[PDB]
Design an enzyme around this catalytic site. Structure first.
Site, short mmCIF file in Angstrom:
data_model
loop_
_atom_site.label_atom_id
_atom_site.label_comp_id
_atom_site.label_asym_id
_atom_site.label_seq_id
_atom_site.Cartn_x
_atom_site.Cartn_y
_atom_site.Cartn_z
N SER A 168 0.60 -1.33 0.12
CA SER A 168 -0.16 0.06 -0.17
C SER A 168 0.93 1.17 0.05
O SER A 168 1.59 1.35 0.84
CB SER A 168 -0.81 -0.10 1.08
OG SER A 168 -1.97 1.08 1.12
N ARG A 169 0.72 2.05 -0.96
CA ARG A 169 1.47 3.38 -1.01
C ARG A 169 1.23 4.30 -0.02
O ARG A 169 1.96 4.90 0.79
CB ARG A 169 1.43 3.90 -2.37
CG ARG A 169 1.62 2.91 -3.59
CD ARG A 169 3.04 2.76 -4.01
NE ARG A 169 3.30 4.15 -4.69
CZ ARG A 169 4.60 4.04 -5.32
NH1 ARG A 169 4.95 3.14 -5.79
NH2 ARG A 169 4.66 5.28 -6.02
N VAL A 170 -0.18 4.44 0.36
CA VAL A 170 -0.49 5.32 1.52
C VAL A 170 0.05 4.82 2.76
O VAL A 170 0.56 5.55 3.42
CB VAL A 170 -2.21 5.54 1.42
CG1 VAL A 170 -2.53 6.22 2.45
CG2 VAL A 170 -2.51 5.98 0.23
#
Ligand SMILES: Nc1ncnc2c1ncn2[C@@H]1O[C@H](COP(=O)(O)OP(=O)(O)OP(=O)(O)O)[C@@H](O)[C@H]1O
Ligand SMILES: [Mg+2]
Lengths: 179, 501, 53, 479, 59, 145, 72, 245, 70
Positions: F75-77
């Site tokens: 997950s980038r966030v």
């Protein structure tokens, strides 16, 4: 060149040549070119949507006023049947190049700023002929502001082969010094 | 540098004696310019392969003489070639102006200088595509071409007139090996030519700078196309480099040609031919890809004595991806080139520069290439490395090394040290013969592995300085004489004693 | 070192000599360009008499 | 002054028919006088990619072609895309075209430069291999950068790539006099917003007084049409080679990410109808890459130095996109996930980072020896980790009690406090010279600092700071 | 090597002067031609050019 | 195709305070063929999308339901998304799970290992059991905490 | 022209007239709970939706400056 | 190829002789045909190959057959691109040949020369009514050993030798000896290696192979077999390795 | 650009345009190359019919295109 436009035009010339209507057919073909210049007239014949049956009736009326040659009227009818009316303009232009070949005439086009008398042209048209190998030479003239005082003749199969002296001497000198 | 006072005489000279001859010249009209290839209507008397020149000064080679138009390979970007502008048929057929004045100049694909040092003067033209020498006009390769790298000149020897491939992964020392060979030709009358296809402009500049610094630009032409420059010029640049090399080949000089890479020609031909919508083959490279290199590399030949015994030694360079030598391009060039030089990236990352994988490298003309001193001296060497490939195998398996295996394995590590060299410091033939000999006999066995490379440098310097009779034997007799062998040993004893303290 | 440093200074001196010589040549070229104007004028007339028949 | 009419619109690809005399040559921009949904004029900018003959070009739109009509007037602008360059560009988010997309109004710039330009000529290049001093202890030691050379960041997110990118942007402005230019090629809008707000917090872009900033940001979004994602690599390049050619600076051009630029080109080639090359890439892949990478070079005036992110498709280094890109690259910097778990910042993997430039003839003999030793010491420690768990630190031999200890100190020494992270962590950053880095790893590898604790080397800049930190720790412990 | 720089310099400058000078001469020539006898000299040159062409053809 | 997906995917993201802080969370579902994540559509949609939640049928038959292959999923966030309460709890969990993925090879050999290593394997297996859920039994945040 | 339906009934030569609008759907609060098709016309068999605003199908995405970092 | 073939065919037909027709390389003949086909405009059937590949290959190949008046014995080398025998050019050629000799690259990396992969090479004449029962019962029993060894290699590549059973290990030792025995120095290859080549008569070859399979030579080391002509040479070579010490 | 426009054929067509005719009996060879002929005419052949050439060759009419016959 051998493309569909060229292929059709060559056929049209060959039938004229057989029947000895080369002068008679050529006039009619020149007459056609005036007809098909008009955007509205060309568009009507060219587009697929207008019904083919309607096209023939209009074409017949056009032929009568025009008074075209019996084969020439066929040739357009053949184009219409075989869908190649979208390339009539290419075909008509192509015929002129073929027609010169059959006669053995060659076009040359000679360029000056200043209109020139026939005597100069006669030498050039004789000069292009021997150099050409021509049976006959037909001369085309154009007026150009840009050169200097000379001119350039263009001849050959295309207008490929151009031999000139006016501006070119200046250009040659410009190149020559840099050497 | 006084120019202005003679210009009034000089300007007049240019106008003076100018013929202004008028002849019929073929001209054509540009139909379209696209994908590096122009179509020209007109030109009913061009020849196939004739240079046609556009208004912009761009030069194109006529190749598809179709029935109504001509297809033209636009040598250069067609970016200023405007549709409808005229072309001129030159009548010359794919020529590079070539002369002696090329040497020491960096050059473009079209042979116009890009080093900014003014014009280059040529009387005579050699065609860009011209026939290779036939089956009669060659003879067998017998001279050496000393690269100055020990691993090549001892074990994969390169003769003059040989095509010898330099193959490997990117950043494995390929340019350096080729560059080293060029540096080392200072004495000899060899006219090395360096073709840089598709490479970085900055990278090419460093190589050119290095040659001037080392003074090897007295006998080198650097034909550099670069990564920026259009596929057509990269495709055509080797042929230009080859054309220059021939001028010296058929004038009885000897020549080296370095095509760096021929990988990047093959991709510039694939770019050219896919843009022309020619059916691609395997790895999308066209069927002409073998005939592309094979035209280029068959021009490199040891000429016969009836033609003057010129030669052209080709070192083409190919990049492989992950050492895959079953690839379509490297398998094409291995089948052309007489033997290859594998630069493996496992050795290069381990600090074994020059990373010549010796097992994997063949020279077809192996030992008719070497001099007599080399053939004797390097006969020992070739075997010891063969022992040492197998003794390094199961070395940790047996693991309690008896001195039959261990001393042959300790000999082996030292042997590998000899093969090591610094970049662009090529060795003379005598040094190589002397260096190979010292290592083979076990003289360096006592020395620490980090001491071997510092020793030998001292021993070579000792020998040039104290004992110059050794160089006179190997350079004249070219045979590892008994007098020569003894003469070396005394220096080795003298040198070894000095090194200790 | 000492020889090496001396050589480096000699190289700098050579650059100074070479830098100065180029500048002198440029100045001389400018003067020439200013000089021999008649060649220019007459030089211009030069081509004219031979350029055409 | 040339007016054309769209002949056809097929996706993002337009065909424009011009009168027979006046005619654009390739890469000229075209402006298409179109209308909007509500009916006001809005104009789509194109770029001629082919000349189809019969006075007809094939242009690729940089904006959306929804709503364009056959026969609308197309004004040939007579040049390729002119992009505003100069002082004004700094701190502004830019489109492909040079329009500001940051909402601060018009760039009041009178200077524009076309984006299609030849490379600097062979005469004009600079040969002298200079190390680019970033001021980061890992980069200056183990993976040094060319000045005027190309760098590959092999990092994902969560490894602090953006902070590392910002430190470089920040450091060049301070140590040198130069600037940086970020070119986000096909960047997601969310991470285009996050990066742009990280620059304002870190003071890299000065919001209060802008054009005192250090970055000119150029963003090509993912939802831009595929002809707009190729040319943001060149818009950023053109704006960066103004600062080389005119201001004579040492520039950093960051192209994020270099893969994407290659992909976009492939899509336009496919849109244009070219036959696809090996692995589906465009046939012009070797040339379109080289047309970009050869403008990133060091001339006699200044130098632009691209630190360009690299994505490796299918983890295949022999894929054409990676392979083509790799030839140009000179140094690679691998940002490690495993170092961010340990907490070392920046998380530059010292064993997987390489450089063409770490050769003794290039960086000097002393620098090379230390770098090689550090890798070896670091390498041995990595090998020993399995062994230490099994045998423990006491059971190792006396050499390997040491190369474990020295390796730990070296690992800690590589981590450094950054200027950009002062907001987030509070501890002041340290720009560290290339000499102070080299002198520092001598004192660890020579063993003259064996007595110091390991958390005296952590997040310190200079070698002296670690000793100073060590002494303070002893005093605190004594207290 | 520095002296070789000057050698080249002396050549570049020379060439430039030669060219610029030639260029002017060219300008003057053009001017005069623009004034030289339109139908008289123009015609003469045309004839000459024609003659030359003819000669070329024969060869 | 890349343009087509990107155009659709780019539309949904979190708006600013001047536009009302509306959001739009896109959960695209792409089905990969025989786990080829390098095919032409999943290579396109991965580079557009921030995170990825890889589902593997070799975990689904193994009983781990839902079959989220958490090692691969990214997950980038990241922890910007989680609540403060979740961040503290999750952080310990990620580390423990990471250790267990390192020691899956040791699980056959857990008897011949010390307590620290053995406990990690022992804890990890329980940790994997927390993750499992029946279909359409979504846990509230407090239940996840 | 890509048909939003089967083109079986279309007869060659039959005229087609351009609408002038570009791919809108009626959009409202009154969709919550309706299974609708691609043109936003309900297919659940429950009747017409009350809608008053029209949305384009191809609307431009929010820009860079109009967004916010994800924090929820 | 046709020109060479025409001349060879004339000798057989008119001089009624027996002809050898060596061709290097028939792959090139197909490749040239492929290059011209693209210029011709024929659609490319597979890879870049010309559609009439089988026919072009077939026309050239069919003419080579031996008749009642004479005989053509053609030995033709065929290039195999990227070591891929499934390429259209190599694959099409297989149908025509009476005996294929598939050289391997993996055997040339080890240095076994000639690098003839002994399992992939097949001949039509290897039949007991053509070669006799003695040659046939060995040539199977050689290929049964190598084939067994080939299967074993996947297992040995990871574990190594030690795991194998005693039957498997014995075959592996025999297979290794057998592979080395096949290697031979050539008269042409004296300019590479310097070791003089050896002409090995068929009778000598059969006898040598029987011994290796029988095991009378199980005590000898493996490098005693490498690059020798007879089995007698291996024995003589074997002593030197043992004697030297 | 396409077969059956050999300019024998077009001229034959112009001469007979005001006509009706069925060429179904015999068909003229336009092209022959490498195993395949392109036959003009033969409007009465059926897909798969053996057609015999003048020299004496039997061919099979596979493609019955609207201009010519494969
Ligand atoms: N013999 C050597 N000793 C020391 N350094 C070397 C040697 N050979 C090459 N190098 C250095 O190694 C680096 C890679 O070498 P080089 O550029 O020659 O390899 P390459 O195969 O040409 O790679 P590329 O594909 O990048 O051109 C260069 O910096 C080069 O100077
Ligand atoms: Mg190189």
């Amino acid at each position: 060149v051998d493309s569909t436009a060229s292929r059709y035009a060559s056929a049209l010339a060959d039938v004229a040549d057989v029947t000895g209507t080369l002068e008679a057919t050529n006039s009619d073909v020149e007459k056609l070119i005036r007809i098909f210049s008009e955007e509205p007239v060309y568009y009507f014949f060219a587009n697929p949507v207008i019904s083919i049956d309607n096209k023939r009736s209009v074409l017949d009326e056009i032929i009568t006023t025009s008074g075209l040659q019996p084969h020439t009227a066929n040739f357009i009818n053949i184009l219409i049947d075989s869908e190649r009316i979208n390339l009539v303009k290419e075909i008509l232009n192509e015929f002129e190049d073929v027609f010169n070949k059959i006669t053995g005439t060659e076009v040359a086009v000679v360029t000056s700023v200043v209109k020139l008398e026939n005597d100069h042209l006669a030498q050039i048209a004789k000069g292009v002929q021997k150099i050409t190998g021509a049976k006959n030479v037909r001369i085309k003239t154009v007026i150009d502001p840009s050169l200097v005082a000379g001119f350039t003749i263009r001849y050959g199969n295309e207008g490929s082969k151009l031999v000139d002296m006016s501006v070119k001497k200046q250009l040659e000198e410009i190149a020559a010094q840099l050497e | 540098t006084i120019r202005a006072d003679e210009i009034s005489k000089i300007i007049r000279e240019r106008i003076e004696g100018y013929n202004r001859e008028v002849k019929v010249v073929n001209t054509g009209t540009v139909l379209q310019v696209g994908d590096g290839i122009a179509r020209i209507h007109g030109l009913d008397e061009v020849m196939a392969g004739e240079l046609v020149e556009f208004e912009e000064g761009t030069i194109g080679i006529a190749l598809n003489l179709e029935s109504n138009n001509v297809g033209v390979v636009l040598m250069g970007d067609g970016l200023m070639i405007q549709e409808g502008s005229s072309v001129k048929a030159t009548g010359r057929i794919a020529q590079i102006p070539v002369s002696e004045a090329y040497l020491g100049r960096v050059i473009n694909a079209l042979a116009k200088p890009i080093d900014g040092r003014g014009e280059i003067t040529a009387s005579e033209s050699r065609l860009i595509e011209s026939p290779a020498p036939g089956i009669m006009s060659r003879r067998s390769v017998y001279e050496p071409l000393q690269t100055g790298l020990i691993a090549i000149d001892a074990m994969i020897p390169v003769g003059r007139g040989q095509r010898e491939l330099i193959i490997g992964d990117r950043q494995t020392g390929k340019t350096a090996v080729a560059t080293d060979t060029i540096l080392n030709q200072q004495g000899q009358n060899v006219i090395c030519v360096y073709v840089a296809i598709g490479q970085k402009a900055s990278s090419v500049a460093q190589v050119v700078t290095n040659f001037q610094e080392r003074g090897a630009m007295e006998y080198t032409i650097v034909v550099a196309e670069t990564a920026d420059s259009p596929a057509t010029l990269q495709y055509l640049a080797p042929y230009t480099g080859a054309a220059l090399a021939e001028y010296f080949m058929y004038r009885e000089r000897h020549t080296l040609i370095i095509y760096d890479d021929l990988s990047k020609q093959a991709q510039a031909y694939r770019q050219m031919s896919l843009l022309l919508r020619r059916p691609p083959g395997r790895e999308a490279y066209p069927g002409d890809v073998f005939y592309l290199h094979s035209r280029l590399l068959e021009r490199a030949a040891k000429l016969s004595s009836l033609l003057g015994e010129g030669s052209m030694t080709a070192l083409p360079i190919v990049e492989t991806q992950a050492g895959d030598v079953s690839a379509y391009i490297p398998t094409n060039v291995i089948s052309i080139t007489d033997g290859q030089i594998f630069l493996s990236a496992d050795l290069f990352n381990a600090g074994i520069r020059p990373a010549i994988n010796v097992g994997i490298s063949v020279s077809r003309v192996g030992s008719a290439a070497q001099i007599k001193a080399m053939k004797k001296v390097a006969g020992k060497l070739k075997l010891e490395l063969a022992q040492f490939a197998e003794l390094e195998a199961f070395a940790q398996f047996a693991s309690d090394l008896d001195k039959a295996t261990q001393n042959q394995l300790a000999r082996g590590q030292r042997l590998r040290e000899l093969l090591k060299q610094p970049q662009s410091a090529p060795l003379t033939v005598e040094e190589q013969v002397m260096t190979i000999y010292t290592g083979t006999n076990g003289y360096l066995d006592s020395l620490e592995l980090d001491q071997v490379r510092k020793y030998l440098v001292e021993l070579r310097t000792y020998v040039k300085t104290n004992k110059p009779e050794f160089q006179e034997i190997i350079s004249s007799t070219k045979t590892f004489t008994e007098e020569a062998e003894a003469l070396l040993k005394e220096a080795i004893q003298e040198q070894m004693e000095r090194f200790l303290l | 070192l000492e020889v090496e440093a001396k050589l480096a200074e000699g190289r700098k001196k050579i650059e100074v000599e070479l830098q100065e010589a180029l500048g002198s040549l440029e100045q001389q070229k400018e003067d020439t360009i200013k000089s021999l104007d008649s060649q220019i004028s007459a030089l211009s007339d030069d081509i004219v008499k031979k350029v055409l028949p | 002054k040339n007016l054309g009419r769209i002949a056809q619109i097929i996706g993002p690809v337009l065909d424009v028919a011009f009168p027979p005399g006046k005619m654009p040559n390739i890469y000229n921009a075209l402006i298409v006088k179109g209308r909007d949904t509500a009916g006001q004029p809005m104009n789509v900018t194109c770029e001629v990619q082919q000349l189809l003959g019969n006075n007809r070009v094939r242009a690729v739109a940089m904006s959306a072609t929804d709503g364009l009509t056959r026969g609308m007037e197309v004004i040939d602008t007579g040049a390729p895309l002119s992009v505003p360059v100069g002082g004004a560009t700094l701190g502004r988010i830019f489109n492909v075209l040079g329009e500001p997309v940051d909402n601060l109004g018009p760039v009041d710039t009178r200077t524009t430069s076309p984006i299609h330009r030849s490379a600097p000529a062979f005469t004009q290049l600079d040969t002298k291999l200079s190390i680019f001093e970033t001021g980061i202890k890992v980069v200056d030691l183990l993976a040094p950068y060319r000045r005027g050379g190309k760098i590959g960041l092999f990092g994902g997110a969560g490894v602090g790539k953006t902070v590392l990118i910002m430190e470089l942007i920040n450091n060049i402005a301070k140590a040198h006099g130069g600037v940086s230019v970020f070119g986000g090629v096909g960047e997601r809008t969310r991470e285009g917003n996050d990066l742009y707000m990280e620059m304002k917090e870190s003071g890299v872009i000065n919001e209060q007084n802008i054009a005192e900033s250090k970055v000119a940001l150029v963003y090509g979004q993912m939802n831009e049409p595929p002809g707009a994602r190729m040319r943001v690599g060149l818009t950023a390049l053109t704006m960066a080679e103004y600062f080389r050619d005119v201001n004579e600076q040492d520039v950093l051009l960051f192209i994020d990410n270099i893969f994407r630029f290659v992909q976009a080109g492939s899509e336009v080639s496919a849109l244009l109808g070219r036959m696809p090359s090996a692995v589906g890439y465009q046939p012009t892949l070797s040339t379109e890459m080289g047309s970009l990478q050869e403008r990133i070079t060091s001339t006699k005036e200044g130098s632009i130095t691209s630190i360009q992110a690299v994505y490796v498709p299918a983890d295949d280094l022999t894929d054409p996109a990676p392979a083509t890109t790799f030839a140009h690259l000179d140094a690679t910097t691998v940002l490690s996930r495993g170092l961010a778990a340990k907490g070392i910042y920046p998380a530059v993997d010292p064993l997987d980072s390489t450089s063409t430039m770490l050769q003794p003839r290039i960086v000097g003999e002393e620098h090379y020896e230390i770098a090689q030793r550090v890798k070896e010491t670091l390498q041995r420690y990595k090998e020993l980790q399995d062994i230490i768990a099994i045998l423990g630190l006491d059971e190792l031999s006396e050499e390997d009690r040491l190369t474990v200890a020295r390796a730990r100190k070296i690992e800690r020494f590589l981590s450094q406090p950054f200027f950009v992270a002062e907001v987030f962590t509070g501890s002041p950053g340290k720009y560290v010279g290339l000499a102070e880095t080299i002198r520092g790893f001598q004192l660890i590898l020579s063993g003259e600092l064996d007595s110091l604790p390991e958390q005296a080397f952590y997040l310190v800049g200079n070698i002296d700071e670690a000793t100073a930190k060590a002494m303070n720790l002893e005093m605190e412990s004594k207290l | 090597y520095k002296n070789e720089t000057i050698q080249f310099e002396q050549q570049k400058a020379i060439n430039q002067v030669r060219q610029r000078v030639f260029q002017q001469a060219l300008q003057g020539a053009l001017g005069t031609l623009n004034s030289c006898l339109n139908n008289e000299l123009h015609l003469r040159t045309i004839n000459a050019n024609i003659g030359m062409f003819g000669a070329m053809n024969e060869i």
